[PDB]
Amino acid sequence: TGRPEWIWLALGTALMGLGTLYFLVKGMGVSDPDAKKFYAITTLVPAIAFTMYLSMLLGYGLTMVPFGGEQNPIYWARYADWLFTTPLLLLDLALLVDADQGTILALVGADGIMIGTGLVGALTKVYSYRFVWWAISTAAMLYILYVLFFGFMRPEVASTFKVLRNVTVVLWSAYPVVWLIGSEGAGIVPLNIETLLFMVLDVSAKVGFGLILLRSRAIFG
Amino acid sequence: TGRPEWIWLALGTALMGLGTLYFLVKGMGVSDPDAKKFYAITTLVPAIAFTMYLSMLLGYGLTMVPFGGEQNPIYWARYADWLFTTPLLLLDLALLVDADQGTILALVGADGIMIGTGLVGALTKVYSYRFVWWAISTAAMLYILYVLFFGFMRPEVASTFKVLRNVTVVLWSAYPVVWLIGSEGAGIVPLNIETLLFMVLDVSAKVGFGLILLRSRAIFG
Amino acid sequence: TGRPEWIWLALGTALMGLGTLYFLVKGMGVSDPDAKKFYAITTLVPAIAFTMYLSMLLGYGLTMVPFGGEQNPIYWARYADWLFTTPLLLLDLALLVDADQGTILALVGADGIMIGTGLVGALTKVYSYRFVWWAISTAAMLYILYVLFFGFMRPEVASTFKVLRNVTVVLWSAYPVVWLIGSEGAGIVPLNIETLLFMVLDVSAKVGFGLILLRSRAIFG
Numbered sequence: 295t296g297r298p299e300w301i302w303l304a305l306g307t308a309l310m311g312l313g314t315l316y317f318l319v320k321g322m323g324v325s326d327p328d329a330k331k332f333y334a335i336t337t338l339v340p341a342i343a344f345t346m347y348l349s350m351l352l353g354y355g356l357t358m359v360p361f362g363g364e365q366n367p368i369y370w371a372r373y374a375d376w377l378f379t380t381p382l383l384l385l386d387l388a389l390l391v392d393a394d395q396g397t398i399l400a401l402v403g404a405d406g407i408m409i410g411t412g413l414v415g416a417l418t419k420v421y422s423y424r425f426v427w428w429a430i431s432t433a434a435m436l437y438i439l440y441v442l443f444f445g446f447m448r449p450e451v452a453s454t455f456k457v458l459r460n461v462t463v464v465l466w467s468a469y470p471v472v473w474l475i476g477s478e479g480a481g482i483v484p485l486n487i488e489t490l491l492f493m494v495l496d497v498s499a500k501v502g503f504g505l506i507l508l509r510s511r512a513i514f515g
Numbered sequence: 516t517g518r519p520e521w522i523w524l525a526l527g528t529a530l531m532g533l534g535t536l537y538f539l540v541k542g543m544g545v546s547d548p549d550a551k552k553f554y555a556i557t558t559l560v561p562a563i564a565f566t567m568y569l570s571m572l573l574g575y576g577l578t579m580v581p582f583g584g585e586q587n588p589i590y591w592a593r594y595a596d597w598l599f600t601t602p603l604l605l606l607d608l609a610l611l612v613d614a615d616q617g618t619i620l621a622l623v624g625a626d627g628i629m630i631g632t633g634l635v636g637a638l639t640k641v642y643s644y645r646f647v648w649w650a651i652s653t654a655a656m657l658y659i660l661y662v663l664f665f666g667f668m669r670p671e672v673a674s675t676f677k678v679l680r681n682v683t684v685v686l687w688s689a690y691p692v693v694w695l696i697g698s699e700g701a702g703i704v705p706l707n708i709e710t711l712l713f714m715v716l717d718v719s720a721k722v723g724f725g726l727i728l729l730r731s732r733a734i735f736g
Numbered sequence: 737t738g739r740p741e742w743i744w745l746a747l748g749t750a751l752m753g754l755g756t757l758y759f760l761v762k763g764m765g766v767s768d769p770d771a772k773k774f775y776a777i778t779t780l781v782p783a784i785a786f787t788m789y790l791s792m793l794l795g796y797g798l799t800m801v802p803f804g805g806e807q808n809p810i811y812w813a814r815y816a817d818w819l820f821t822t823p824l825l826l827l828d829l830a831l832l833v834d835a836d837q838g839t840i841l842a843l844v845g846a847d848g849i850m851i852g853t854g855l856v857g858a859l860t861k862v863y864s865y866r867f868v869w870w871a872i873s874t875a876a877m878l879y880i881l882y883v884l885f886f887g888f889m890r891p892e893v894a895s896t897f898k899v900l901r902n903v904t905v906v907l908w909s910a911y912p913v914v915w916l917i918g919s920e921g922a923g924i925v926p927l928n929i930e931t932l933l934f935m936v937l938d939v940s941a942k943v944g945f946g947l948i949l950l951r952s953r954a955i956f957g
């Protein structure tokens with residue numbers, strides 16, 4: 295199509311689809327309720343991302359937001375994605391360490407705040423205010439990372455939890471930077487490069503994360 | 516009103532309302548926590564449908580979607596309905612057989628994918644792509660039906676579960692067909708007939724299903 | 737800004753923010769899982785309200801709804817707020833008295849119906865129908881209050897539950913009145929006064945309620 299980021303949307307669509315079918319095949323057989331739980335959550339994540347990548351690819355998850363006296367193309371469908379997939383990823387983590395419900399509610403709630411404010415930021419027509427929403431969203435992220443480190447077993451659990459937690463902090467932290475420097479933000483880095491950055495992070499945080507998780511014996515009772 | 520499907524919207528509004536008041540009266544008295552659970556879920560379903568039928572009746576849940584070079588009237592409020600009511604119906608089933616949380620999450624998640632993609636399909640302005648969303652949605656449905664049959668007691672539970680599961684597969688399967696042949700799809704069958712088909716399915720899947728369920732002793736500890 | 741209700745939006749933004757930081761500091765230290773649960777829920781409430789107050793302040797949560805042959809300014813972001821915060825407040829109550837899941841599902845479901853119909857009412861372009869949605873929403877509220885009184889311990893639990901339940905019925909009941917007499921409704925009381933009324937209720941129902949709750953020992957095992 296007439297959009298140069300189409301290739302990354304198509305590649306992300308493809309990789310999320312393949313990841314979904316892999317984990318779907320993979321989870322065939324599992325009878326342990328606990329593992330079943332990790333398979334459900336972890337397959338749903340790239341399944342959802344698959345549809346939102348397709349929606350961006352086909353142009354449905356794309357809108358135009360006027361700001362800085364111009365018509366800026368915003369892929370809103372990333373937030374419909376993250377809205378659902380980021381809490382699920384946090385659940386994987388939470389279930390791994392047997393977190394209190396209070397801590398899970400704090401994380402999921404913090405998360406919704408993170409994406410929803412990111413969304414508002416993305417759709418806001420007053421340029422300056424866009425970065426107020428960014429700041430609040432980033433504060434929510436920082437709370438989440440705080441909890442992951444100070445708000446929380448079988449060594450297998452701990453070992454896998456430590457790895458995925460590290461994967462999580464490192465990739466999740468890059469998203470505010472990408473946003474801030476890309477088309478939604480200061481407009482430093484073009485949309486096509488921004489889309490590639492998000493595709494590389496999304497596949498790693500979704501399919502990379504799930505591969506690490508689902509190969510672990512930490513998921514079995 | 517100037518819409519010939521108004522009669523079916525009015526009749527559905529009426530039947531969902533009556534079903535809600537019946538199950539509300541019916542559940543008065545119930546102290547068994549387990550049955551209480553089935554009453555809550557099963558009353559909420561036509562209550563929600565009642566509001567969405569009223570919203571379509573009054574014209575609020577109706578929008579115009581350009582495709583095939585025409586202004587197509589789409590009742591989007593059906594998806595706000597299903598978004599909430601189809602997972603609840605799946606919960607009735609899941610609680611009946613004491614399903615693992617992993618299986619419940621897979622079903623609810625599969626379900627959201629089903630309706631959300633149906634919604635995107637419904638609102639998509641490129642005619643051809645409408646049926647890509649249909650296909651994905653249908654794949655989600657097929658997964659759900661798979662799980663209902665291969666992903667899962669007191670004989671009462673089994674007996675009622677077997678009946679409602681059969682009701683479920685048969686009516687849920689007709690919805691993709693109706694969509695595909697009606698105004699959202701190929702435009703084979705007019706909107707007023709399509710609305711009647713959906714009203715007959717919705718009342719049967721909601722009020723018919725609940726009557727069968729709530730008369731059963733399968734719902735009591 | 738050019739809006740005379742800005743001061744109340746700014747004051748609400750401020751008070752919700754301060755309430756969020758107070759309860760966040762306050763909950764530092766808590767290790768009792770049960771109390772943790774009450775801290776999560778109760779901090780999230782004004783956190784969410786903070787963002788929606790900011791969104792109204794900045795003008796993002798404001799839209800124009802034509803009715804009565806005029807362009808009526810509707811703050812839709814109040815419903816995005818309530819959609820999440822009113823169920824959470826009901827959870828605080830529900831967890832306090834150890835409510836059955838059936839009763840919690842009935843309350844949360846009743847609640848979503850309440851706000852969602854309030855939203856539809858708010859955005860409806862046919863003046864008369866606006867009050868049909870109001871009536872249904874009010875019926876949902878009345879059900880909720882019914883349950884709080886007839887649908888349900890340590891004396892501490894009972895004592896705090898009795899107080900907060902009284903706070904709840906009294907403030908929640910004023911919201912339908914405010915709506916009905918203000919800009920969304922009959923247009924009796926101007927928007928700026930309406931916004932002040934909602935700001936006073938919101939801070940009391942959110943921060944006032946949380947202060948009463950979180951000072952109680954009812955929240956600890």
Ligand SMILES: *C/C=C(C)/C=C/C=C(C)/C=C/C1=C(C)CCCC1(C)C
Nearest residue numbers: 412428431432435466469470473499
């Ligand atoms: C499945 C994809 C994942 C793990 C995406 C994570 C996205 C975030 C952690 C986003 C955070 C952002 C902020 C902290 C600042 C504002 C903009 C956002 C939403 C990109």
Ligand SMILES: *C/C=C(C)/C=C/C=C(C)/C=C/C1=C(C)CCCC1(C)C
Nearest residue numbers: 633649652653656687690691694720
């Ligand atoms: C309360 C009403 C019920 C049980 C409705 C069920 C609706 C479905 C099972 C819808 C499925 C569809 C597809 C599988 C294809 C795409 C379009 C849909 C959403 C009509």
Ligand SMILES: *C/C=C(C)/C=C/C=C(C)/C=C/C1=C(C)CCCC1(C)C
Nearest residue numbers: 854870873874877908911912915941
């Ligand atoms: C955090 C704020 C709270 C507790 C807000 C509560 C709001 C309600 C109880 C709203 C109810 C309304 C109706 C019953 C009638 C229609 C309009 C509403 C949504 C204002």
